[PDB]
Design a protein around this ligand. Structure first.
Ligand SMILES: Nc1ncnc2c1ncn2[C@@H]1O[C@H](COP(=O)(O)OP(=O)(O)O)[C@@H](O)[C@H]1O
Ligand SMILES: Nc1ncnc2c1ncn2[C@@H]1O[C@H](COP(=O)(O)OP(=O)(O)O)[C@@H](O)[C@H]1O
Ligand SMILES: Nc1ncnc2c1ncn2[C@@H]1O[C@H](COP(=O)(O)OP(=O)(O)O)[C@@H](O)[C@H]1O
Ligand SMILES: [Mg+2]
Ligand SMILES: [Mg+2]
Ligand SMILES: [Mg+2]
Lengths: 124, 77, 41, 519
């Protein structure tokens, strides 16, 4: 390409891609935040043909959505795995993963090394 | 000046050579060669991780030294 | 409110697995510092 | 005035190749070391891949420049020969070429650069061998430390406490440590199953299969006798075109009855051996397991696993001592395998696995089940575990150990600077270039750790000149220290092969002077 690296594609690097990943995860979590707890509300989902789906299940919502970003597909599969292994918590797990990502990227912006953030998360 | 450049750094180098021509009228090729060499060495210095401003300051220091050495070894006609 | 006396209970496995999986997801996403998106063929 | 060199395209090609190689090296420089991070790569089809492995990264990014392709091949060769160092080798190659840049500009011939690089390479192999220390395969702590060092760079490093002992046990279980001169890692099977976390990984001494059990109700078998069946349990079928011509009403019932009787005789000859677990090979062109055969086996209380692949046969036999049977006549008791248990275990609704554990003939084979919350993290865990196994393989091949943390590269830089000062000529410049090129691994390690690369590398060079040849970059303290106290060790083979292969690739790229576009 324009850069010396002749790879036939685009390349994001550093705070750009970290902020992008966090943006994607936050997007996915903000989709489902409104359906959490006894006061959460349900969602309609229309499948481009008039097929309607009412639901509060975060795993169901993230399965029905058509996600393009890989850092958000990760959280969708996370919700699926929570539904497979537990059967409840499919929204809370996504919300918590996204918030952990947010705070961890804040630390990495403050220039705490991601290895150190990861060790601290593992310990915690 | 005749070169139809699009890169802004090449435009800066054209301006540098034009400035040498305005002030002196000779050296218009030496200035460009030397600036290119300085940037080529800054390339390796940046690879080793030095701050580009630190590189610029070391270059300023060495330039002062070289100017004084020129004044020292100069002759008169 | 005292939720143990109110009757708001969740299986321990819910919170434990939620935490473990969320941490694993955060770690995998946080480990990424670059992205190369190849043009499709 | 010598030769005018009327042509400049050779030099342009050399500089373009050097630039492409240096660009690749600088692109993957960030994935080097314990403080290095991973790259995500989305293929044209959309297959996502997160990885810290240099060979994987380079194979997955469809580089287009010839020199970059050659660096990809170089990293693949390093992955073959050592399985560890696939990033260091590419970085070394890129750096040597970046030095060829200034050499060429100085006006040295590529042939002279190549020969002087070969000289520096031989001297550097000498130096690294001098640095090395021998190792006994009985030194389980040394093996654990080598594996932990190999894993420190990967996403699976908080689980090193779990995956280093497994990565050493597997290799020490699939080799006779007294006679082994190498190891075939195809003897180590890796089974990626989604679900759980990477702390759920397991080392199964027996056999693991993804094929499902066909019987309903029989999921667990104790004192299991296992048989491999390369023949089909279904209606008879000659290898020639065969038909059964019916001309009377009685012959229809007779056909059904004789088919039943054939199948029943088969399953009875199977039961008569004491077999209670039956692995049936996969059979196209003929039904390997008819409904009658399954009915009869279930009634006879035999667990049945069909659709075994013709490539897992040698593995299953090596594992559970079975002998594959292709004719019912030869199906006897000596052709079975004895296993203390065979169970179809469920993984928290994330799938099922058949685990054959315990064996009277556990012959030099082991399996590792890799768990994880995501496909990407599972794939990178698999890759890292493979890197650890290859590190242990290097240790088995060459019983020599070298310090880490950039200590070998720094010692190389230093002693090859000395060699250059002693080799006065135009070879001196090239050897000094080789040395300063080998000085890039410590600089990268420091940069990634977050230190000041110049000061850190100067302190390292100074301490190695004083004599602390086992001194490296302590990313835990944040500066320089004796790296063996941090237990950062790696097989000498890794560094030696990296240097050798990088130098050979550099000489190859230096022997190039033109590019043609075929057709
Ligand atoms: N009666 C209640 N009072 C307060 N909090 C509740 C009550 N019921 C559920 N919650 C909270 O709601 C959260 C999750 O709600 P919900 O969206 O139904 O589950 P999921 O996480 O499976 O989507 C839990 O963390 C739980 O603490
Ligand atoms: N006869 C000569 N012998 C050796 N060096 C010379 C001679 N004439 C000029 N030079 C050198 O060539 C260099 C380049 O100058 P030149 O290219 O001619 O002018 P400019 O740099 O302004 O285009 C000068 O630094 C000068 O010292
Ligand atoms: N805990 C550690 N402390 C210091 N250096 C380390 C540590 N772990 C690994 N290294 C260094 O990192 C390098 C390995 O990085 P890695 O990502 O495996 O690159 P490569 O695949 O090229 O070996 C080795 O040269 C080793 O010296
Ligand atoms: Mg719920
Ligand atoms: Mg002039
Ligand atoms: Mg490694």
């Amino acid at each position: 390409m324009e850069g010396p690296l002749s790879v036939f594609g685009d390349r994001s690097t550093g705070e750009t891609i970290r902020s992008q990943n966090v943006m994607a995860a936050a997007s996915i979590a903000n989709i489902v935040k409104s359906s959490l707890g006894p006061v959460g509300l349900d969602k309609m989902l229309v499948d481009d043909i008039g097929d309607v789906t009412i639901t509060n299940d975060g795993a169901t919502i993230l399965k029905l959505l058509e996600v393009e970003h890989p850092a958000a597909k990760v959280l969708c599969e996370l919700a699926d795995l929570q539904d497979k292994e537990v059967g409840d918590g499919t929204t809370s797990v996504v919300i918590i993963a996204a918030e952990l990502l947010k705070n961890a990227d804040e630390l990495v912006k403050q220039k705490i090394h991601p290895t150190s953030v990861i060790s601290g998360y593992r310990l915690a | 000046s005749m070169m139809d450049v699009d890169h802004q750094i090449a435009k800066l180098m054209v301006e540098l050579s034009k400035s040498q021509d305005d002030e002196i009228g000779d050296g218009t090729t030496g200035v460009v060669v030397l600036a290119g060499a300085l940037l080529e060495e800054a390339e390796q210095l940046l690879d080793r991780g030095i701050h580009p401003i630190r590189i610029a300051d070391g270059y300023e220091q060495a330039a002062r030294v070289a100017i004084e050495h020129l004044d020292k070894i100069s002759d008169s006609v | 409110r005292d939720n143990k006396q109110a009757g708001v209970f969740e299986p321990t496995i819910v919170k434990v697995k939620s935490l473990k999986f969320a941490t694993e997801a955060a770690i995998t996403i946080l480990r990424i510092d670059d992205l190369i998106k190849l043009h499709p063929e | 005035k010598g030769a005018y060199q009327d042509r400049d395209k050779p030099a342009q090609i050399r500089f373009s190749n050097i630039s492409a190689a240096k660009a690749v090296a600088d692109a993957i420089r960030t994935s080097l070391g314990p403080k290095g991070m991973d790259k995500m790569i989305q293929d044209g089809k959309g297959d996502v891949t997160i990885t810290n492995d240099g060979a994987t990264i380079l194979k997955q990014m469809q580089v287009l420049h010839p020199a970059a392709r050659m660096l990809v091949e170089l990293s693949k060769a390093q992955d073959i020969e050592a399985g560890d160092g696939t990033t260091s080798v590419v970085i070394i190659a890129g750096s040597l070429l970046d030095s060829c840049t200034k050499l060429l500009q100085k006006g040295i011939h590529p042939t002279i650069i190549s020969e002087s690089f070969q000289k520096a390479l031989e001297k550097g192999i000498e130096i690294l061998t001098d640095m090395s220390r021998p190792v006994e395969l009985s030194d389980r702590e040394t093996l654990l430390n080598s594996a932990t060092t190999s894993l420190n760079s990967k996403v699976v490093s908080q689980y090193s406490s779990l995956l280093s002992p497994m990565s050493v046990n597997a290799v020490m279980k699939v080799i006779d440590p007294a006679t082994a001169t190498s190891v075939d890692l195809r003897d180590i099977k890796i089974v990626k199953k989604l679900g759980g976390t990477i702390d759920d990984c397991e080392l199964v001494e027996g056999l693991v299969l993804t094929q499902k059990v066909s019987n309903s109700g029989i999921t667990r078998v104790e004192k299991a006798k296992i048989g491999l069946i390369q023949f089909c349990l279904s209606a008879p079928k000659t290898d020639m075109d065969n038909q059964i011509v019916v001309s009377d009403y009685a012959q229809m019932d007779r056909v059904l009855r004789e088919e039943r009787a054939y199948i029943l005789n088969l399953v009875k000859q199977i039961k008569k051996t004491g077999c209670n677990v039956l692995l049936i090979q996969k059979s196209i062109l003929r039904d390997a397991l008819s409904d009658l055969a399954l009915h009869f086996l279930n009634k006879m209380k035999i667990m049945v696993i069909k659709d075994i692949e013709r490539e897992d046969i040698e593995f299953i036999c090596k594992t559970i001592g079975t002998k594959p049977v292709a004719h019912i006549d030869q199906f006897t008791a000596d052709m079975l395998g004895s296993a203390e248990l065979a169970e179809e275990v469920n993984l928290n609704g994330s799938g099922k696995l058949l685990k054959i554990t315990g064996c009277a003939s556990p012959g030099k084979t082991v399996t590792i089940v890799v768990r994880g919350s995501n496909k990407l993290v599972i794939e990178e865990a698999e890759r890292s575990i493979h890197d650890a196994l290859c590190v242990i393989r290097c240790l088995v091949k060459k019983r020599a150990l070298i310090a880490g943390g950039g200590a070998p590269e720094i010692e190389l830089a230093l002693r090859l600077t000395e060699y250059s000062r002693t080799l006065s000529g135009m070879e001196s410049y090239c050897v000094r270039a080789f040395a300063d090129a080998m000085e890039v691994i410590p600089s990268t390690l420091a940069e990634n750790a977050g230190l000041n690369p110049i000061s850190t590398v100067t302190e390292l060079r100074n301490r190695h000149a004083q004599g602390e040849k086992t001194a490296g970059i302590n990313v835990r303290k944040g500066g320089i220290s004796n790296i063996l106290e941090e237990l950062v060790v790696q097989p000498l083979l890794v560094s030696v092969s990296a240097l050798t292969l990088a130098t050979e690739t550099v000489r190859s790229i230096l022997k190039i002077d033109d590019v043609v576009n075929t057709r």
